[PDB]
Amino acid sequence: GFVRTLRARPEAGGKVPVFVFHPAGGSTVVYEPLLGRLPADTPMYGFERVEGSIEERAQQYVPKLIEMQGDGPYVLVGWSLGGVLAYACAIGLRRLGKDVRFVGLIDAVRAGEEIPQTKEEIRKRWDRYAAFAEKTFNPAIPYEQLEELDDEGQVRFVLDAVSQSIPAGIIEHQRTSYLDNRAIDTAQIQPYDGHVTLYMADRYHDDAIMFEPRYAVRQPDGGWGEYVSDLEVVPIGGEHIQAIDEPIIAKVGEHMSRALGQIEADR
Ligand SMILES: CNC(=O)c1c(-c2ccc(O)cc2)oc2ccc(O)c(CN3CCC4(COC4)C3)c12
């Protein structure tokens, strides 16, 4: 289905599982370095890609989480897009009366300024892509047809226009890559009352920034303090893309190991 078993829990008993959520344009196999930095026999389950907006995706994850974990306790972790998803499932699980005891965001850092959900920003965004496209591959943007479509329809319209004038594999990967990245842009973040740990790097890469220049700035709280009162930030340095790999993940994992040991003590 959409759940990957990174390390199975025992048939009965054992430690609380860690649930990790896939990143944008990728799979939960990227949490394997983190797993090696966690306590021995920590179970870990990865939730992979499903369709919908952020809240509609959590409408599919939450019932599976409760099948696998019941009342709790819940430990939800995600890098890149995964962080938003883990947080979204923290809010869904809290409303159902579930015990969430750790939400771990690995550099799930919001744009320094809010991204407007407007028609003018649609036009600004498609002009930005258009200019890059003539550069890296050597016309009139039909704005009225694009402003009336969602992200999925926008992308289909633009691929169909190329066909009307590319191998299937390249297309499928960039379609999910782009859509997951827009899912981060468009996320409508809801307040959460539990404890959130945010592992914060220094900066997004110059590729991400060129796609949306408002990622050139990060607030100290990563954009989350308005929505979380019990917010902890762990500075890890480096770039967004290296927060998930060795050796920086060793710093993430040492911190998370202490949080999991405390959760195991209170059981
Ligand atoms: C190229 N980099 C990317 O991030 C993006 C890709 C894209 C397209 C095709 C691919 O194959 C791979 C990626 O589409 C996007 C659409 C909107 C957007 O605002 C961004 C910028 N991202 C949004 C959230 C972000 C901050 O944390 C990650 C950066 C992107």
Numbering used by the authors: 1454 to 1591, 1595 to 1621, 1625 to 1726
Anything the authors wrote about it?
Because Pks13 crystals were available to guide the synthetic program, several ligand/Pks13 TE complexes were generated by crystal soaking as the project progressed. As 6 was the most promising molecule from the assessment of the P3 SAR, a crystal structure was obtained for the 6/Pks13 TE complex. Compound 6 made the same key interactions with the Pks13 TE domain as 1; these included a hydrogen bond between the hydroxyl of the P1 phenol and the amide side chain of Gln1633; a hydrogen bond between the hydroxyl at the 5 position of the benzofuran core with the carboxylic acid side chain of Asp1644; and a hydrogen bond between the protonated N of the P3 substituent and the side chain oxygen of Asn1640. There were also van der Waal interactions between the P3 substituents and the phenol sidechains of Tyr1663 and Ty1674. In compound 6, the 2-oxa-6-azaspiro[3.4]octane group reached further than the piperidine into the TE active site; the oxygen atom was positioned in the area of favorable polar interactions further stabilizing the water molecule that in the complex with 1 was hydrogen bonded to the hydroxyl side chain of Tyr1663. The 1-(aminomethyl) cyclopropan-1-ol 16 and the 2-oxa-6-azaspiro[3.4]octane 6 were potent in the Pks13 assay and had good MIC activity and microsomal stability, with reduced activity in the hERG assay. Both modifications decreased the logDpH7.4 and amine pKa (predicted pKa was 9.4 and 9.2 respectively) so were considered worthy of further investigation. As highlighted during the SAR analysis, compounds 6 and 12 had the most promising in vivo activity, treatments with both agents resulting in an ∼3 log10 reduction in CFU. Compound 6 had the best all-round properties of the series, but as its in vivo efficacious dose was likely to be high, a cardiotoxicity study was performed to ensure that the hERG liability had been eliminated.
Polyketide synthase 13 (Pks13) was identified as the enzyme responsible for the last stage of mycolic acid synthesis, the condensation of two fatty acid chains into an α-alkyl β-ketoacyl chain, a direct precursor of the mycolates. Pks13 contains the catalytic domains required for this condensation reaction: an acyl transferase domain, a ketosynthase domain, acyl carrier protein (ACP) domains, and a thioesterase (TE) domain. Benzofuran 1 was identified as a potential lead for TB inhibiting a novel target, the thioesterase domain of Pks13. Compound 1 was synthesized originally during an H2L program based on an initial phenotypic hit that had been shown to target Pks13.16 Structural information generated during the H2L program identified the following interactions between Pks13 protein and 1;17 after a ligand-induced rearrangement, 1 bound in the fatty acyl substrate binding groove, blocking access to the Pks13 TE active site where the catalytic triad (Ser1533, Asp1560, and His1699) is located.
